[PDB]
Amino acid sequence: MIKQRTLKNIIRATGVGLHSGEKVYLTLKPAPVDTGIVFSRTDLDPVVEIPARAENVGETTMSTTLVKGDVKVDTVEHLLSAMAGLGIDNAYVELSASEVPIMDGSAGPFVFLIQSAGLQEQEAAKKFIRIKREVSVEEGDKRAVFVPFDGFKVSFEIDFDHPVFRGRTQQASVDFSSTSFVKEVSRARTFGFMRDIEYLRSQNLALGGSVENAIVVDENRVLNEDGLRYEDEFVKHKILDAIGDLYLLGNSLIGEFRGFKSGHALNNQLLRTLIADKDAWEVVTFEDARTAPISYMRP
Ligand SMILES: C[C@@](O)(C(F)F)[C@H](NC(=O)c1ccc(C#CC#CC2CC2)cc1)C(=O)NO
Numbered sequence: 402m403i404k405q406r407t408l409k410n411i412i413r414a415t416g417v418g419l420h421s422g423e424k425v426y427l428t429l430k431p432a433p434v435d436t437g438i439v440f441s442r443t444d445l446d447p448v449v450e451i452p453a454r455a456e457n458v459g460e461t462t463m464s465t466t467l468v469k470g471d472v473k474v475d476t477v478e479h480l481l482s483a484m485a486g487l488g489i490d491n492a493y494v495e496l497s498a499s500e501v502p503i504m505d506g507s508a509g510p511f512v513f514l515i516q517s518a519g520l521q522e523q524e525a526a527k528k529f530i531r532i533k534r535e536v537s538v539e540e541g542d543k544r545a546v547f548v549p550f551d552g553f554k555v556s557f558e559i560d561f562d563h564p565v566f567r568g569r570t571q572q573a574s575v576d577f578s579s580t581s582f583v584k585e586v587s588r589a590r591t592f593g594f595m596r597d598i599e600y601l602r603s604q605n606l607a608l609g610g611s612v613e614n615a616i617v618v619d620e621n622r623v624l625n626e627d628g629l630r631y632e633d634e635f636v637k638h639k640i641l642d643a644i645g646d647l648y649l650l651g652n653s654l655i656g657e658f659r660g661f662k663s664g665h666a667l668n669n670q671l672l673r674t675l676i677a678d679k680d681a682w683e684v685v686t687f688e689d690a691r692t693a694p695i696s697y698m699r700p
């Protein structure tokens with residue numbers, strides 16, 4: 402039996418918002434069975450809770466944002482990617498400000514803090530969304546597609562005409578029957594281009610960004626003096642983002658995702674189209690883990 406998982410102990414962390422530049426205190430807490438991931442703005446009275454679900458996604462221009470009325474929770478995809486890769490079904494995410502801390506720009510710090518606290522399996526079947534039919538959305542030259550697949554794999558292809566990508570292709574495929582999310586995906590940092598940052602800051606965006614929490618690229622080079630963690634770190638973060646955006650479905654996926662220059666906006670459009678086309682998916686459990694198409698590491 403593949404059981405639901407929550408946190409064994411609370412996780413506490415402080416950081417800065419990538420776009421707001423605000424200092425934020427973060428607390429992850431255990432949650433009962435079938436709670437899902439629920440964000441909670443504890444700086445407000447009364448506290449405002451936003452379930453990390455596709456129906457609550459607001460603006461998506463920079464990062465994935467959850468909204469409830471006039472209240473927002475910004476930049477959720479990196480923490481949600483850590484949630485998905487670790488198999489965490491239920492948790493409360495308390496924040497003292499509107500944006501999740503960026504940490505080092507990747508999901509690595511979140512993954513380490515969670516695994517240091519430990520996970521707790523719960524006495525209930527883990528629910529999966531199994532893709533039954535192909536579902537694709539396009540807009541312009543961008544495309545995102547779900548494909549039936551007995552497992553979970555993610556492929557992505559970006560097409561930048563930038564010298565930092567000169568040499569090789571900008572494509573990567575990850576199949577978690579062999580790829581380690583922790584070792585090969587979680588540490589890929591977000592990236593920004595120096596030409597955009599001065600404009601972004603003019604619009605009160607990317608205010609917390611620096612070489613401490615992002616790969617900074619000029620017209621030719623990565624400016625971080627210590628370089629990259631992966632040779633293909635850029636596309637690996639696109640895969641990291643997709644895994645986090647996909648977890649807004651509320652359950653782990655049994656299927657294949659393929660992204661072609663897709664972003665947070667098209668990712669959410671794919672989820673909304675999938676959810677609406679109930680012929681294309683179903684909820685499944687596995688009463689015997691030994692016959693499941695996926696497996697999780699020990700809690
Ligand atoms: C990677 C992706 O482009 C992805 F969408 F492709 C997207 N990155 C961003 O938005 C983004 C990342 C970093 C900065 C920055 C800074 C700085 C600085 C100091 C030196 C002046 C700005 C924007 C993402 O990860 N969204 O979730």
Ligand SMILES: [Zn+2]
Nearest residue numbers: 478591638642
């Ligand atoms: Zn990102």
